[PDB]
From a paper:
[name] is a human plasma glycoprotein and a member of the albumin gene family that has been reported to be a multifunctional transporter of hydrophobic molecules such as vitamin E and a potential binding partner for Wnt signalling proteins. The availability of four independent [name] structure models from two different crystal forms provides insight into the flexibility and dynamics of the molecule, which point towards a significant conformational adaptability when binding to hydrophobic molecules, metal chelates or proteins with hydrophobic acylation such as Wnt, supporting the potential function of [name] as a promiscuous transport molecule in human plasma.
Tissue-specific transport by [name] could greatly enhance the resolution of [name] imaging in blood-flow studies. As no crystal structure of albumin with a contrast agent is yet available, we selected gadoteridol (Gd-DO3A), which is used in medical applications as an [name] contrast agent and in crystallography as a lanthanide phasing compound. An even more dramatic cell contraction dominated by a further 6 Å contraction in a compared with the isomorphous ortho­rhombic dehydrated crystals and an almost 13% decrease from the monoclinic cell volume occurs in the orthorhombic [name]–Gd-DO3A complex crystals. Whether this decrease in cell volume is mediated by the single Gd-DO3A molecule located at a crystal contact or is a result of shifting local charge distributions owing to the lower crystallization pH of 5.5 versus 6.5 for native [name] remains unknown. After a few rounds of rebuilding it became clear that large parts of the protein had become severely disordered in the Gd-DO3A co-crystals, and owing to streaking and discontinuity in many parts of the map the model could not be completed. Subsequent occupancy refinement indicated Gd occupancies of between 0.9 and 0.7. Our proposition of Gd-DO3A being present in [name] is based on a preponderance of evidence in the form of plausibility arguments, augmenting the reasonable evidence for strong Gd difference density. The validation report for the Gd model states an automatically extracted resolution limit of 2.69 Å.
Author numbering: 13 to 118, 138 to 169, 187 to 305, 309 to 504, 521 to 546
Write the structure that this text describes.
Amino acid sequence: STQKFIEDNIEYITIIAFAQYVQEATFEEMEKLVKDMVEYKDRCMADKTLPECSKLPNNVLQEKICAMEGLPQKHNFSHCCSKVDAQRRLCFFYNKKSDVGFLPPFLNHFLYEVARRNPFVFAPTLLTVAVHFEEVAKPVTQYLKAFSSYQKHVCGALLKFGTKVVHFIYIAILSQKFPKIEFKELISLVEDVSSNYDGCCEGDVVQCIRDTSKVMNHICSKQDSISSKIKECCEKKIPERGQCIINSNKDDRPKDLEGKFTDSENVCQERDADPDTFFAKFTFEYSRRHPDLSIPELLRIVQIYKDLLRNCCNTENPPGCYRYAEDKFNETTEKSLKMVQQECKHFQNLGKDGLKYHYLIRLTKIAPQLSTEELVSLGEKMVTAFTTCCTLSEEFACVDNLADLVFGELCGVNENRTINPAVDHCCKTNFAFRRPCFESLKADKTYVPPPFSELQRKTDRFLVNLVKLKHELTDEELQ
Ligand SMILES: *[C@@H]1O[C@H](CO)[C@@H](O[C@@H]2O[C@H](CO)[C@@H](O)[C@H](O)[C@H]2NC(C)=O)[C@H](O)[C@H]1NC(C)=O
Ligand SMILES: C[C@@H](O)CN1CCN(CC(=O)O)CCN(CC(=O)O)CCN(CC(=O)O)CC1
Ligand SMILES: C[C@@H](O)CN1CCN(CC(=O)O)CCN(CC(=O)O)CCN(CC(=O)O)CC1
Ligand SMILES: C[C@@H](O)CN1CCN(CC(=O)O)CCN(CC(=O)O)CCN(CC(=O)O)CC1
Ligand SMILES: *[C@@H]1O[C@H](CO)[C@@H](O)[C@H](O)[C@H]1NC(C)=O
Ligand SMILES: *[C@@H]1O[C@H](CO)[C@@H](O)[C@H](O)[C@H]1NC(C)=O
Ligand SMILES: [Gd]
Ligand SMILES: [Gd]
Ligand SMILES: [Gd]
């Protein structure tokens, strides 16, 4: 099983866990833990029933980190060690910092200097971009920076909206990626992936391999009863196989080109029967029939539909009103697609930099409490969405998926943030409707500024500071 892999890479698996949780730590300190864990494992191979060996492999990791001589004082995390094992795991999670400018620029030494610079990335990923980093003659950064962004974006969602929206996300994700799948199958594969994100986000490295491998087992076991593009991925070795399936393209779709949720007369009953399944089923069926849409849109629609029935199943002749839920989608969808086209012309009528400067002003205008480097970063992640996939088929399926990531960054990953009462309302309200929430924000009315007085980053920093300074002015002035 995977159980072998975890013991084989224990050196790495410990390094990552530590490095992420405590980014401020040295490599000297990493070796100290590595030995304790290695020796600990051998004692668990020296006795099957040893009291320390009935313990879970992360609440061992964090107990040693805390036990380690004056380490919590030297990296300000003593308050995490003064908590019960569960509260301590959550604390250690809150301890992980995303804005890592306080560190210097730049296997075991690499995994240290990645993990502590990329703390929220999943273990499977890092270990894959070690095997997929073991080169011979002198790129890959592109892949890692992307895989962090979606993992942070979900572990964001999980924190703020609990363990319900993450399901809906991964129904829309997997149903769109694997249309040939069946509901009862996929819904199980989701309550695996959802239960995986519980441990991967919290930072439980060891589980994030177990539950990740369990998920890839769950796919490959129904290989040609799910997909036909990941055939050579299931022949790859842990955890390449993990990131192979994830990195692959969406399945070719069946011969079927639905209206049970609209046409039927007992929709309220099937909704009242078991809501979250009924909705889960609606997101399943609508997703697999729309592989040219965004993940945020496939939730916006499901939410809108949940709102439609909520207003419908409380009136004489229910169906009459939810008859054209189908048409109400093709409306709100085509509006959103055309709205992407309106900003993909602003791109042509400015270019990378020209648009970059537009957003930075805007992004700062609405959220000027943020850091200049924080606001700068988003401005490049935002323009990356338009850089690629904003002049081709499914240009909406991307720019929406990709722009949504930059608001998760803004709203924070592992903290309930206080930016301004409006940006806060866009973050801590609804996951689906945060992009349109942000799109509808004017200048931060309530803001009291402080004093002030590469080249591309330098330019941006200047603009963001210039905007923060002259915040009482308008978009066209500052340009
Ligand atoms: C990080 O840890 C250090 C050491 O525990 C903290 O420094 C102490 O601060 C308290 C009150 O702020 C004083 O009573 C101690 O005398 C300080 N000791 C030393 C050696 O400085 C520091 O406050 C912690 N930083 C944060 C942000 O919590
Ligand atoms: C719509 C475009 O996204 C099409 N896209 C353009 C190339 N992308 C750029 C990007 O990610 O926007 C980088 C490589 N890409 C990354 C990935 O998806 O895993 C793999 C191939 N993808 C699979 C997919 O899209 O699901 C389709 C090709
Ligand atoms: C497919 C995997 O790559 C999973 N993926 C990992 C991160 N990706 C990296 C990248 O896309 O290059 C970006 C996210 N993605 C953007 C897009 O696909 O255009 C939307 C959400 N997807 C849904 C899906 O398309 O399966 C799940 C997240
Ligand atoms: C009637 C429409 O407004 C339905 N609406 C469509 C999109 N909205 C736009 C908006 O908020 O007017 C944003 C989503 N919305 C945010 C919010 O309302 O705070 C959460 C869900 N709401 C719940 C409600 O408030 O009835 C219904 C969704
Ligand atoms: C953030 O708020 C949500 C809901 O209000 C809550 O579930 C979550 O635990 C909070 N996270 C914190 C305080 O870190
Ligand atoms: C929604 O729009 C798509 C794309 O043009 C179209 O193929 C589909 O038939 C439309 N659906 C409805 C119900 O009008
Ligand atoms: Gd002991
Ligand atoms: Gd993706
Ligand atoms: Gd792609």
